[PDB]
C-alpha cells in the first residue's frame, strides 16, 4: 500500500508562500527558461499564452522575439491551403507533439500531462513537483523496476516513465547563477506555480485589504447591534410574580 | 412508574436535580414549557384554567424570555424561592385528554382540529 500511495513530500519554504509573499519573478524567468530548454520537448502548456509573460518575467520586446523564433500554423489563405508563420504575442505555447496518441507513442506508452495546472492538479502541488523532479534515487532492496521505467519514490506506484531530466548544468542561466539540480527544480516549480495561479499577487492583496476592512466592519456592526439593543438589554421589568 | 420515581432510581434523581437547576435559573415551572400551539389540548386546558393562573404563567414566560435575551439568570434569592414542578396544568390537561378520548370512542367529532399549515 505504501508503494502505490507514494512517499509523502516535505513542506518547503517557498518564496511565494505567506500572507504578503509574492512570486520571485527572477525565479519565474529562470524557471521559464529551463522549461523551454529541457522540458518543452515532452510536455505542453496549452493554457499559457506568450502575452502572459509580459510584465511578469519578460518585457514585451523579449516576448515578441521569443514568439517570433517559433513557427505556428494559421488558417486558410486566399488559396485555401494551410501555411505556417512566425508566432505573435497572443499565440499559445507550442505543443511538442501532434496529439495525445503521438505523445504516448513517442514517450513509450505514457502521456506527459499538461503542465499548465500541474501544481493545482496534485495534492501538495508545489512540494510534490519539486520532490518528484529532484528525488530520482535508487530503489529499495527488494523491488525491481522494468526496463523503460525509472524509480521515483514520490510518484504514486513507485515507478515513473519519465527519465531523470534535471541534471546539473543542463540549462545555462542568463543570470549566471549555478545550474544546480535543486536550483533548477525550485525555478521550475516557481514557474509552474505562477502558470497555475497567475493571479496570486492580486488575489492576496485584495484579500488582505478586504479582511482588514471587514474586520473594521465587524467591529462597527457589533457596536451598532449593541447600541440598537441597548434599550432592551438594559431595561427593568416589573411583572408581579415570584415563582 | 418504577424507574421514573426519583426515590427508587438514582438516575432519575440526578435527572430531576438537573431539571430543577435548569428551570430555576430562568424561574419558570415545568408546565410553562408546554406550548399552547403544540397540542391545542394545552390550549384548551389553559382556556379552562383561571385567569390568575394564566396571567402568572404568562408573567413567568415573559420573565424567562427577558432573562434569556439579557444573557443572565435569576439572582440567588429568587432562584431559591423558585418552585418548579408545582403543577397547575397536568390535571386539566389529563381531563381534556380523557374527554377527547371518550368523544373519539363514542363516535363524535373533534371539538377542534389543527389547521393545515
Amino acid at each position: 500500500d505504501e508503494a502505490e500511495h507514494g512517499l509523502a513530500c516535505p513542506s518547503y519554504p517557498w518564496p511565494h508562500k505567506g500572507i504578503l509573499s509574492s512570486y520571485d519573478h527572477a525565479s519565474i524567468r529562470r524557471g521559464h527558461q529551463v522549461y523551454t530548454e529541457v522540458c518543452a520537448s515532452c510536455h505542453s502548456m496549452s493554457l499559457i499564452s506568450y502575452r502572459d509573460l509580459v510584465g511578469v518575467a519578460y518585457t514585451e520586446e523579449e516576448v515578441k522575439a521569443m514568439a517570433a523564433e517559433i513557427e505556428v500554423v494559421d488558417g486558410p489563405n486566399d488559396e485555401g491551403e494551410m501555411f505556417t508563420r512566425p508566432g505573435k504575442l497572443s499565440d499559445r505555447f507550442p505543443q511538442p507533439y501532434a496529439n495525445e496518441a503521438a505523445a504516448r507513442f513517442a514517450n513509450g506508452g505514457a502521456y506527459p500531462p499538461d503542465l499548465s495546472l500541474i501544481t493545482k492538479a496534485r495534492h501538495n502541488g508545489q512540494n510534490y513537483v519539486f520532490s518528484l523532479l529532484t528525488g530520482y534515487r535508487d530503489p529499495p532492496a527488494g523491488v525491481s523496476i522494468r526496463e523503460g521505467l525509472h524509480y521515483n519514490p514520490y510518484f504514486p506506484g513507485g515507478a515513473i516513465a519519465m527519465p531523470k531530466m534535471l541534471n546539473d548544468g543542463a540549462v545555462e542561466y542568463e543570470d549566471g547563477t549555478p545550474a544546480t539540480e535543486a536550483q533548477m527544480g525550485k525555478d521550475v516549480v516557481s514557474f509552474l506555480s505562477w502558470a497555475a495561479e497567475p493571479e496570486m499577487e492580486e488575489r492576496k492583496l485584495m484579500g488582505f485589504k478586504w479582511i482588514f476592512v471587514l474586520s473594521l466592519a465587524l467591529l462597527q456592526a457589533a457596536y451598532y447591534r449593541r447600541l440598537r439593543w441597548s434599550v432592551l438589554k438594559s431595561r427593568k421589568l416589573v411583572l408581579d410574580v415570584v415563582n | 412508574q418504577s424507574f421514573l420515581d426519583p426515590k427508587k432510581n438514582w438516575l432519575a434523581a440526578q435527572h430531576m436535580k438537573s431539571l430543577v437547576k435548569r428551570l430555576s435559573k430562568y424561574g419558570l415551572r415545568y408546565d410553562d414549557l408546554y406550548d399552547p400551539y403544540y397540542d391545542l389540548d394545552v390550549k384548551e386546558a389553559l382556556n379552562r384554567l383561571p385567569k390568575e393562573v394564566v396571567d402568572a404563567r404568562h408573567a413567568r414566560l415573559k420573565r424567562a424570555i427577558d432573562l434569556s435575551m439579557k444573557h443572565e439568570y435569576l439572582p440567588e434569592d429568587l432562584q431559591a424561592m423558585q418552585t418548579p414542578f408545582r403543577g397547575y396544568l397536568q390535571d386539566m390537561l389529563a381531563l381534556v385528554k380523557r374527554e377527547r378520548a371518550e368523544r373519539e370512542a363514542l363516535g363524535g367529532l373533534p371539538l377542534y382540529q389543527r389547521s393545515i399549515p
Binding site: N243 | V53, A56, Y88
Partner: peptide, 14 residues
C-alpha cells in the same frame, strides 16, 4: 430563603 407555601400567592391558591 425558602419557596413560598402553596397557600401564599393568588395563582398558587387558585
Amino acid at each position: 430563603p425558602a419557596p413560598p407555601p402553596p397557600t401564599a400567592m393568588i395563582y398558587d391558591r387558585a
